[PDB]
Design a protein around this ligand. Structure first.
Ligand SMILES: Nc1nc2c(ncn2[C@@H]2O[C@H](COP(=O)(O)OP(=O)(O)OP(=O)(O)O)[C@@H](O)[C@H]2O)c(=O)[nH]1
Ligand SMILES: [Mg+2]
Lengths: 249, 56, 102, 160, 51, 167, 142
């Protein structure tokens, strides 16, 4: 809450790392412990990211290529819902926050306002008719994280449940390159996309624009403003060396 | 011979002609409004291919 | 007469195989073995020898595969009513495959 | 110790969709694979059917192939690693021995004298510790070294 | 993944060592072994029931 | 008129010259000392045929002295010479010339166009898709398709062999 | 058996409607052998590979006087149509001749060109009882 005074104490408490990851067996207090930390943080009026389940990103509905970050990806549904609740949870503090770097030109529909707050920005992110929401959310997440990393005086607590999903690949795979090249007939293009399924390398979570933002804050030093209290999830399906088919009932 | 000729004609006419959409829209990720999610993924990235194979 | 004789599986018969090949080749005029046909060479003269089964490539079938000139269609239905006779006017430069000279 | 079904149900009087009962080739069994086995409809015995689809031994064989695929699939999703073939010199002290091929000897302990007992077979090495060995050409390390936790450091869990 | 299987000849390594495939060809000469060229890499399936 | 004759295999005489390889491959780590030890030569004898060369770093092959104790054989000895197998087939090989048979096509003309139709009985499922250039890892793919100024063209490739299907 | 249609009528018992192991029934009676499929035309009741050679039975193997009918696993070849020679097959009652040659036959086995069970029925090979039972099933008019 007041970190700047306690800086030495804090840094020794984590031993120089940026916050903690809590780990255990399936079904001990982990997700619950994270809930509690969000409660402690937000009751004390600290700005708090809370990703309640990481699987909404890495194992998602669908995956778009991000709009203004070449070579990265989005989970558009995860992102939108996040931008929504983040805003309404932190709205008090986020309305005081002035934007140090965001373009002042953001595309806007007639009768709508240029965001002057971080709150206003997050708002601008998720309030649109689809499909527009989809590209808006990309831009908005990029700039949101760019804004977070630029704030050095205000304590920021990032709680992610199931960090271990962010540290390896998402379950999306790169599109087969023949989706990118255009086609005349399937008859002879020298193309198999319709004949056989195949696996292409998985997209690593670090190439998700959001997770990119966070990793950027972890790995760069000169950010002792931020505290990751984060969690693990062992919620995986059981596998013992033979698997039948699960009875669906 | 003519039953065969005719059924070959039919088989090929079917392979060549378009079909109804194969996915059941009552479930997800397909129920979602045609302006979002999977349908976005289809309209911009997959459309050409989906039409080449005639939605078989 | 007293020989070591291989047994069971055919691998163990390496010697015998060589002999059976040598013998076979020696006895069997190419002039005769010419005439043995593979199913596809035979089927090449069927009016519709090539198309895709439904399992994999079905959507790749083309209307160009149909020998429409071979049959007679009804305008209203779009259906094949009769088939023209195949054999009388049938010209081919290849009754047998090109490499067969009898 | 899996709970899943590994056996195809035996043919009997026609099952119907009921409380407590579903059709035999219903779409909910074997992850919808039963499609391959299904003759739809009120099948007219005399004139129609595909014999293999009612045959117990054949049907069960097919199901068994499908189960095998499931297991194989999950065993490969379970790997995070590749096998690299590294010359005897450059390998860690534990592999400098002779390592019997699979199912040849008793399952083998990595280092009994150093208090490590585990299958040498399943021991996995970090790409970062083998860096000098695997990419000698590169000069500067491609992967940055692992950072490790001081277990003697006073941190939040030691109550200080 | 769909990849090209690959082989590093020992003369090219920064330590010579005997490559497992090379050994495999040795074993195929010794006990004369048919090497099935078309054997799909994806199809390894143990027989669950008996194994 | 025909120009020559070839002797039956039983009449062939082998020489050390034709039997043993004249030349030797050089490993990355190689020294003249190493090579000499490998072929059992004295090092001076190895120099002699190779023109007093000292550093071997720029060479694919070093010439081997006749003085060498362990040479390589040019070709595997337990292999069967082709003259033998062709002695098994003599009549066939004469008929090949008589009938002027250049080739006997195994497949019909258009066969690759129909993937499920021509299955020889050596063929196996699942079919393998044709390869694709950048696909093997995310970095390569990214470099070639997505972001084209990406500096790392592929993820670091261990110099030793990686067996992707294993066991 | 009830009626003896051959010698074996005397030797064999029916044993009611008895089950045999899969794809082994003592007597190979291929009722299905002509069973139309456009898409499966080249894979159904034919060679599993198109690179297989035609069977034994398309060739004259030895010194022959001549034959009465050719076997039914013989495959119909362009020459069967073109040459204009007798092509017979043993079916019941007696023999089926290919008289009217067509290229549409080519590449299939005569199994597939000869309908084993005809929609046509002789009333004179039927007992009055059997004719009754064929009227019950709605085959014969009466
Ligand atoms: N009130 C309270 N309930 C808890 C606590 N720990 C566990 N529970 C209850 O027990 C359940 C344990 O489930 P989780 O906490 O979600 O388990 P987890 O550690 O997140 O395990 P995975 O997600 O499966 O890796 C929770 O749903 C809570 O209802 C706790 O510390 N306080
Ligand atoms: Mg949890």
């Amino acid at each position: 809450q007041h970190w700047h005074t306690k800086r030495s104490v804090l840094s020794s408490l984590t031993n120089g790392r940026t916050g903690f990851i809590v780990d255990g067996p399936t079904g001990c207090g982990k997700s619950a412990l994270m809930c509690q930390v969000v409660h402690f943080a937000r009751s004390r009026n600290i700005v708090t990211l809370y990703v309640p389940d990481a699987k909404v990103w890495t194992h998602g509905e669908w995956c778009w290529p991000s709009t203004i970050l070449p070579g990265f990806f989005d989970a558009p549904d995860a992102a939108r819902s996040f931008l929504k609740y983040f805003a309404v949870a932190n709205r008090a503090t986020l309305t005081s926050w002035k934007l140090r770097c965001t373009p002042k030109d953001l595309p806007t529909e007639q009768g709508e306002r240029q965001p002057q707050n971080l709150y206003e920005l997050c708002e601008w992110g998720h309030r649109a008719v689809a499909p527009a929401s989809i590209d808006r959310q990309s831009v908005c997440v990029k700039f949101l994280m760019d804004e977070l990393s630029e704030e050095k005086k205000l304590p920021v607590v990032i709680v992610v449940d199931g960090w271990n999903l962010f540290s390896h690949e998402t379950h999306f795979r790169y599109p087969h390159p023949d989706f990118l090249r255009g086609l005349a007939s399937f008859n002879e293009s020298s193309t198999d996309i319709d004949l056989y399924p195949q696996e292409l390398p998985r997209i690593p979570a670090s190439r998700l624009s959001f997770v990119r933002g966070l990793n950027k804050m972890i790995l760069s030093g000169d950010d002792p403003n931020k505290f990751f209290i984060t969690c693990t999830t062992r919620d995986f399906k059981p596998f013992d060396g033979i698997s039948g088919f699960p009875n669906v009932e | 011979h003519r039953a065969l000729a005719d059924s070959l004609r039919a088989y090929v006419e079917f392979s060549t002609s378009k079909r109804v959409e194969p996915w059941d829209a009552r479930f997800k990720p397909f129920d979602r409004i045609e302006k979002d999610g999977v349908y976005v993924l289809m309209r911009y990235m997959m459309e050409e291919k989906l039409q080449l194979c005639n939605y078989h | 007469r007293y020989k070591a004789s291989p047994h069971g599986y055919i691998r163990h018969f390496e010697n015998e195989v060589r002999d059976l090949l040598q013998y076979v080749d020696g006895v069997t005029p190419w002039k005769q073995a010419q005439k043995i046909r593979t199913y596809w060479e035979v089927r090449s003269h069927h009016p519709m020898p090539q198309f895709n089964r439904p399992e994999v490539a079905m959507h790749r079938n083309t209307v160009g595969l149909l020998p429409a000139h071979m049959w007679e269609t009804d305008k209203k239905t779009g259906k094949v009513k009769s088939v023209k006779d195949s054999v009388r006017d049938y010209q081919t430069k290849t009754p047998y495959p090109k490499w067969v000279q009898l | 110790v899996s709970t899943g079904e590994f056996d195809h149900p035996p043919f009997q009087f026609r099952q119907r969709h009921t409380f407590n009962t579903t059709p035999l080739h219903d779409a909910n069994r074997f992850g919808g694979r039963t499609a391959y086995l299904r003759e739809i409809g009120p099948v007219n015995i005399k004139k129609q059917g595909r014999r293999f689809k009612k045959d117990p031994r054949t049907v069960q064989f097919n199901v068994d192939v499908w189960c095998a695929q499931q297991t194989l699939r999950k065993r490969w999703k379970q790997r995070d690693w590749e096998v690299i073939e590294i010359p005897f010199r450059l390998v860690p002290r534990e592999q400098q021995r002779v390592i019997p091929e699979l199912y040849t000897d008793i399952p083998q302990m990595t280092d009994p004298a150093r208090n490590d007992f585990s299958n040498i077979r399943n021991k996995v090495y970090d790409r970062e510790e083998l860096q000098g060995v695997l990419f000698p050409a590169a000069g500067a390390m491609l992967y940055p070294p692992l950072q490790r936790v001081d277990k003697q450091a006073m941190t939040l869990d030691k109550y200080l | 993944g769909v990849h090209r299987v690959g082989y590093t000849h020992p003369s090219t390594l920064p330590v010579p060592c005997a490559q497992r495939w090379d050994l495999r060809l040795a074993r195929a000469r010794i006990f004369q072994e048919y090497i099935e060229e078309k054997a799909p890499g994806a199809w390894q399936l143990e027989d669950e029931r008996s194994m | 008129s025909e120009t020559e004759l070839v002797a039956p295999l039983s009449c062939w005489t082998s020489t050390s010259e034709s039997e043993f390889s004249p030349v030797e491959r050089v490993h990355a780590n190689d020294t003249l000392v190493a090579i000499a030890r490998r072929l059992q030569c004295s090092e001076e004898a190895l120099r002699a045929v190779n023109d007093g060369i000292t550093d071997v770093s720029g060479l694919d092959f070093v010439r081997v002295p006749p003085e060498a104790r362990r040479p390589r054989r040019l070709v595997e000895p337990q292999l069967r010479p082709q003259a033998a197998t062709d002695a098994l087939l003599a009549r066939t090989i004469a008929e090949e010339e008589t009938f002027k048979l250049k080739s006997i096509p195994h497949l019909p003309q258009n066969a690759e166009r129909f993937p499920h139709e021509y299955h020889t009985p050596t063929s196996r499922f699942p079919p393998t898709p044709s390869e694709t250039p950048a696909t093997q890892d995310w970095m390569a793919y990214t470099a070639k398709y997505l972001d084209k100024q990406f500096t790392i063209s592929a993820e670091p490739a261990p110099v030793y062999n990686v067996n992707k299907l294993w066991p | 058996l009830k009626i003896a249609k051959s010698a074996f009528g005397f030797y064999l018992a029916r044993r009611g409607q008895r089950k045999y192991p899969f794809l082994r029934r003592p007597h190979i009676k291929n009722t299905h052998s002509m069973n139309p499929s456009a898409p499966y035309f080249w894979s159904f009741m034919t060679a599993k590979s198109q690179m297989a050679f035609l069977p034994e039975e398309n060739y004259i193997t030895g010194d022959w006087t001549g034959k009465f009918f050719v076997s039914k696993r013989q495959v119909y070849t362009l020459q069967h149509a073109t040459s204009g020679a007798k092509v017979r097959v043993k079916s019941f009652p007696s023999i089926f001749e290919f008289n009217s040659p067509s290229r549409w036959n080519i590449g299939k086995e005569m199994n597939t060109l000869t309908k084993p069970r005809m929609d046509l029925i002789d009333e004179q090979m039927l007992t009055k009882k059997q004719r009754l039972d064929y009227v019950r099933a709605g085959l014969l008019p009466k």
